[PDB]
């Protein structure tokens with residue numbers, strides 16, 4: 001192939017200067033909006049950093065204090081005045097517990113009410129991916145079915161927007177997905193995806209297809225195309241799909257999705273993320289020695305891409321329900337402003353990961369009279385035991401520990417607020433003036449062929 005599909009293919013690995021130049025004007029926040037976004041980003045990050053007054057306390061050595069502390073334990077003011085495989089496994093479960101909502105779906109479901117009382121929603125993810133055998137893919141299949149029954153019963157008719165949903169990894173459903181051929185995926189994967197989706201629809205819950213490595217995008221689009229034309233799903237708008245802004249294809253994937261919503265007569269739930277597999281995407285392309293990278297090489301270019309993609313998603317409310325997944329205070333503020341005045345609940349929502357977003361979003365989800373923005377947030381809730389945790393944890397470690405990540409830089413008390421919430425288009429123009437060209441690749445990440 002279709003016009004919109006050909007254009008996805010043609011953009012696969014297009015040069016970074018070219019990709020970033022085309023996004024720039026689509027992501028530029030109009031002056032007045034840009035400053036409202038700066039103001040709100042600044043506030044959100046301020047409150048975050050300075051939760052228990054962590055910067056005002058910073059506005060006031062250690063030897064002296066223990067002396068002052070022991071002096072204050074003297075009850076009387078006068079008296080005082082006058083005077084390898086097991087270590088990896090262990091560290092994994094220790095660092096990973098904060099990211100897991102529970103070990104079983106029922107345990108996770110029972111923890112749901114507290115944040116749901118306040119206006120949060122949930123998307124449960126049964127941990128596990130990259131099934132190696134037929135048996136593994138079967139076991140994931142049954143665990144997903146069980147999760148739907150349990151989530152659907154707790155949803156109890158609340159529907160796709162207000163009630164809980166499920167997220168699924170296609171790699172969990174087909175053995176050796178990473179290398180599987182088109183025909184075997186259709187004959188074997190598709191009937192399982194179709195079946196879980198019919199179940200989700202019987203309970204009227206959202207069912208989201210997660211995005212994984214970039215070599216898998218094309219086939220996920222093929223599976224999506226078919227799923228949207230199932231007669232049993234006609235008139236149901238609960239199908240969701242994740243797109244990754246770090247990909248050069250992302251905008252073209254959107255033009256495709258918009259067309260698919262039109263032809264299949266539905267509103268798609270589209271989760272926009274920046275993307276979780278960047279380190280592997282870079283290694284992978286470097287080992288193939290291909291013409292270029294399928295993802296951006298500077299983080300700021302991903303930020304620009306997200307913004308451009310976000311405007312595109314917000315322009316077609318009849319065709320897409322955007323779900324903006326981020327922990328970045330600027331990103332959130334920009335979307336908030338970009339979405340225009342006259343918010344209505346079903347216009348869009350925010351999303352975050354369990355163990356990462358709560359502090360940002362306690363300022364966002366809830367009543368205005370309590371100082372919140374009154375915008376719903378859906379928490380993505382990993383569910384499983386220690387045997388299914390590893391790949392997810394490692395992705396969380398790369399995200400949290402990267403010096404370009406917002407969650408890492410918010411901690412960095414040396415970096416001031418204004419630099420943290422800086423507008424990314426303005427950052428790209430600043431780089432462009434300094435280097436002589438817009439959208440040059442990362443200096444330390446040369447093209448695979450060098």
Ligand SMILES: Cc1cc2nc3c(=O)[nH]c(=O)nc-3n(C[C@H](O)[C@H](O)[C@H](O)COP(=O)(O)OP(=O)(O)OCC3O[C@@H](n4cnc5c(N)ncnc54)[C@H](O)[C@@H]3O)c2cc1C
Nearest residue numbers: 210211274275276297298299302325327328352380405406
């Ligand atoms: C509800 C939810 C569901 C999710 N499900 C998925 C999913 O299905 N698929 C998936 O891939 N991710 C998924 N994620 C993970 C998500 O992609 C990461 O949390 C997200 O990228 C972190 O972005 P941020 O805006 O919070 O942080 P920011 O710190 O503002 O941006 C972080 C990032 O920018 C990108 N980046 C880092 N360095 C570079 C660089 N040198 N060049 C270009 N880009 C760079 C990476 O995407 C990295 O994650 C999900 C996240 C949420 C909240």
